[PDB]
């Protein structure tokens, strides 16, 4: 679970395709960890476009 | 018996020749003591090799 504030008044991004290392191509960035049933971390990159 | 608590991140060592004389070669070194009817001490060491 995890709780986010969004912007009422931020406009979508201005490039419309989506990427993955791109600063305009999404409005925002989230990352999430975790954990296998062996343990290892894993890193789950939450990307938040209008 | 013993008991090795190993590590699922451990990525496979960059030596493909296993080598006895180098530490990378092996991923750990276990050495156990182990008595025979005379009273010598065999120093056993067991390789772990992922």
Excluded: C, E, R
Aim: hydrophobic residues 30%; negative net charge.
């Amino acid at each position: 679970s995890m709780q986010i504030n969004l912007n009422s008044t931020d406009p979508v991004p201005s490039k419309t395709p989506f990427s993955v290392s791109d600063a305009d191509s999404y409005n925002k960035k989230g990352t999430v960890t975790v954990y296998d049933s062996q343990g290892n971390a894993h890193d789950m990159n939450v990307y938040f476009v209008k």
